Amino acid sequence: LPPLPPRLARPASVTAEANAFPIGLKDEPELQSQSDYFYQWLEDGNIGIFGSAGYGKSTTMMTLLLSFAGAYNPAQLHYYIFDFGNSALLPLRQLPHTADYFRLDDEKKIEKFIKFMKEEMEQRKQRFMEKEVSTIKLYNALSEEKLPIIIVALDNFDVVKEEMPDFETQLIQYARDGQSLGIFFIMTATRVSGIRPPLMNNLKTKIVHYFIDSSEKFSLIGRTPYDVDPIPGRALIKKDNAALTQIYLPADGEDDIEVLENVKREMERLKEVYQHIPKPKPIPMLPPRLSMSVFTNTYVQHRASGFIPVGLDEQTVRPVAINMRTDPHCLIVGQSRKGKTNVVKVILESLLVQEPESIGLLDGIDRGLAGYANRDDITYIEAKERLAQWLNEADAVLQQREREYIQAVNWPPVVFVVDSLLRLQQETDSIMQGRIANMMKQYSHLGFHVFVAGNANEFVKGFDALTAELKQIRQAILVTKKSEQSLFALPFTRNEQEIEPGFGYFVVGGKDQKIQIPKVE
Ligand SMILES: Nc1ncnc2c1ncn2[C@@H]1O[C@H](COP(=O)(O)OP(=O)(O)OP(=O)(O)O)[C@@H](O)[C@H]1O
Ligand SMILES: Nc1ncnc2c1ncn2[C@@H]1O[C@H](COP(=O)(O)OP(=O)(O)OP(=O)(O)O)[C@@H](O)[C@H]1O
Numbered sequence: 001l002p003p004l005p006p007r008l009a010r011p012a013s014v015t016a017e018a019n020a021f022p023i024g025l026k027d028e029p030e031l032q033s034q035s036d037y038f039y040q041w042l043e044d045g046n047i048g049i050f051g052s053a054g055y056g057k058s059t060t061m062m063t064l065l066l067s068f069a070g071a072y073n074p075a076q077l078h079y080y081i082f083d084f085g086n087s088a089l090l091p092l093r094q095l096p097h098t099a100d101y102f103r104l105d106d107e108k109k110i111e112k113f114i115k116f117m118k119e120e121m122e123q124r125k126q127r128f129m130e131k132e133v134s135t136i137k138l139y140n141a142l143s144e145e146k147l148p149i150i151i152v153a154l155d156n157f158d159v160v161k162e163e164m165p166d167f168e169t170q171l172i173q174y175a176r177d178g179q180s181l182g183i184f185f186i187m188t189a190t191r192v193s194g195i196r197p198p199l200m201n202n203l204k205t206k207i208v209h210y211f212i213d214s215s216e217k218f219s220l221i222g223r224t225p226y227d228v229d230p231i232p233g234r235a236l237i238k239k240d241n242a243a244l245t246q247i248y249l250p251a252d253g254e255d256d257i258e259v260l261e262n263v264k265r266e267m268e269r270l271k272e273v274y275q276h277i278p279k280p281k282p283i284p285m286l287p288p289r290l291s292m293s294v295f296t297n298t299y300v301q302h303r304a305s306g307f308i309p310v311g312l313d314e315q316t317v318r319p320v321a322i323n324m325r326t327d328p329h330c331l332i333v334g335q336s337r338k339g340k341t342n343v344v345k346v347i348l349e350s351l352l353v354q355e356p357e358s359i360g361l362l363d364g365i366d367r368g369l370a371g372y373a374n375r376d377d378i379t380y381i382e383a384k385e386r387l388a389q390w391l392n393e394a395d396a397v398l399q400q401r402e403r404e405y406i407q408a409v410n411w412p413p414v415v416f417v418v419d420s421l422l423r424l425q426q427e428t429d430s431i432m433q434g435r436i437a438n439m440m441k442q443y444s445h446l447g448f449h450v451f452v453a454g455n456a457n458e459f460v461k462g463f464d465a466l467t468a469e470l471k472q473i474r475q476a477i478l479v480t481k482k483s484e485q486s487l488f489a490l491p492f493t494r495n496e497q498e499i500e501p502g503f504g505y506f507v508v509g510g511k512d513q514k515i516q517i518p519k520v521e
């Protein structure tokens, strides 16, 4: 009955850790008056915002998230924003509470969010079982280290309804089994046609703005005595009953820009208040680019001997390393212009800092490792007689080590690096290829390591002893598809992506892992 104004600004956030938020001015016919509509924290559950274009769906979302942010710090509240419209939730990306920001085409990013949520819900259910509780409200009441509330904010659900099936199933899980774990879901939507019942029924609070066709309103909420006028912000908010309400604006302002300017100021203020509070981490993602300098410093946390860091795990964004103690040898398998020489550089850079006794470097055709020559540990090999000298010199040391081993108790690395296997078998005979193969099965435990790079066909072409010995090596770095090499039997599909310089596969023990290889320069 009482006339509702067209524009109202929300009250100032003046209650730390509030349990109720004024989101709009509602008509209360039972009193024939007006008062704030208070959304109950946790209890009122997930929020579904509906209405036609231009009637305040995204505006309501902004008022909610900014209100919650004023009461809780980024350690208590985490935002995951899915902006599947026209960047309506883009400003909120600067909120300290915003853990990550997702877009409609962020396919890799979204799939990793799903992985995180599945694990996070698992961990939370396991933390509850220890405290013998079933609610985060109970857990955070009996715990020293409290769990942060997670909110999945999704704008424009219309694109999920059709274009993204696998992602919708997860959203249904979040809405159905999320409240108890501390995970809540707020979403806007225009067309309510294909919103499944297990999602709609888990949207306890429904904020329904004006619809051009009254049919959609009847689908969301039941029959009502009152209807909403075509006024932006005007809505029927149903939880138990529908209350005619004018939703509050995100901030003060006589027009849109003035409001948006004040919103930006408020977010700067929250940034000042919560400055001493740690902000949530984003979903573990691989960097756009990766240099050896960056990889060595900010990623390699542990620099232990006998371990060779070769790249970043795609899934965990953590460095995978070669265990020289359990896998003394390694193959660099790849294709034309894929990253073979660069991987060799990574191994060499990982060496030279572990105090090797000697490093025999047999460069390839292009001479792309001539810069590593003349170093105080590297024996750059060009000629055939020079190679024979290094092998026989390595033979002497490894033989004495065998005599030092028999004498005393149960080694600094003696390393033989081959940038090109094709070039090796082009400047040597099948007899010397047997000598190298012999040293591998005789001195492997005495600190002798080999690293041979080359294209996939180079490892399967030969019938010689060296080829036979190399195809028994279980550890490898693949700068090629798993479906384009005959050395290792690895699971794959036709839909596996193509490899490009900067990526590859870390292979050991019959298992593999997509890795990001740093660029050495
Ligand atoms: N609670 C409100 N009070 C006053 N005006 C509002 C309110 N909500 C929205 N408006 C007005 O409506 C305009 C657009 O609203 P909004 O973009 O939030 O609707 P929408 O449904 O999210 O739009 P679309 O979905 O078509 O992108 C704003 O410029 C604003 O002036
Ligand atoms: N890890 C990497 N990240 C980014 N770019 C790379 C990486 N590795 C190689 N490249 C680029 O690939 C190009 C070819 O170098 P690369 O050593 O990878 O080829 P290759 O494996 O030696 O091929 P071939 O042995 O057939 O000559 C170089 O210009 C280099 O810039």
Ligand SMILES: [Mg+2]
Residues within 6 Å of the ligand: 340, 341, 364, 366, 368, 419, 420
């Ligand atoms: Mg090369």
